Amino acid sequence: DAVRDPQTLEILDITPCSFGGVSVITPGTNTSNQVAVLYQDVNCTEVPNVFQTRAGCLIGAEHVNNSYECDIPIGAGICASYQQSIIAYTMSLGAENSVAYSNNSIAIPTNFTIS
């Protein structure tokens, strides 16, 4: 991981050239032939709608501020879906619900369903 140069006695560090897996994000071909590509654990400055995330550099997916239920997982909280074009978003964990708690209030079902 390091070498002393033979002409000038300089110490150099050696790192591998950037590499990583390449994953293709796609809706099925029944819907679209449009794809997005994830360069896993790679910087967006090393690879050559470019979104840098923890999982890697995601290219071809439009990043939006709207969360949705998870469709195609990317990793690190990011999912992608086809909605048309491919988009990337932080997945929602579900709708929020503040429970109307008080020391003297009880909810009681008045009906039921059979599921």
């Binding site: 909810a107 009681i108 079902p109 059979i114 599921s115």
Partner: protein
Amino acid sequence: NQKLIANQFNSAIGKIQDSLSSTASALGKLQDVVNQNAQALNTLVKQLSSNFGAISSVLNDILSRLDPPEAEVQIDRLITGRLQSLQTYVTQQLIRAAEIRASANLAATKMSECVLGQSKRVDFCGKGYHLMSFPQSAPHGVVFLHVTYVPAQEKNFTTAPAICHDGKAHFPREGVFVSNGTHWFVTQRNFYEPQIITTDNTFVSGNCDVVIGIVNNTVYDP
């Protein structure tokens, strides 16, 4: 509600019928098992086309060209590779079989506890309060139709842990105390059904100076 319950049940069964007829992916858990084993066999068979360093993947071709002193060397390369490929297959099947065994044990447990009984284990026999279940046969598997009771329409009520009648603290025997804003009733917890509070549906223990949140009301004694 017997007529309603029968209708809700019959409707829910019809929904299963349509869901299964429509959604191809519904049985993905069983199809995945089939696919994993199919891939394992296709991989095993395709390995027979590998040379593994030999002059040929075909044993007959090695033997048609070479005499034993040379053929054995080429054959040893195929044996090593084919034996290794077969060992890999078997190991994967033993691990995969263990997963299926665990699933089968779970299925057997559900059969006993969900079909041959009524479970009090939450989310074990479906999502909701388990009533009953019905097994159905499936390719290399079992499908359970879990019938559950689920609370529906909503209403808020005022409550209290106890009622102060004669200075004594009255607690509900089976349900909870509720109020509609003017009158107090006792009702079963999972279904609103208010009843007049009487000495027959409450019990008495201690006095009103200990219970936090106790309210004043009348307990009737027919």
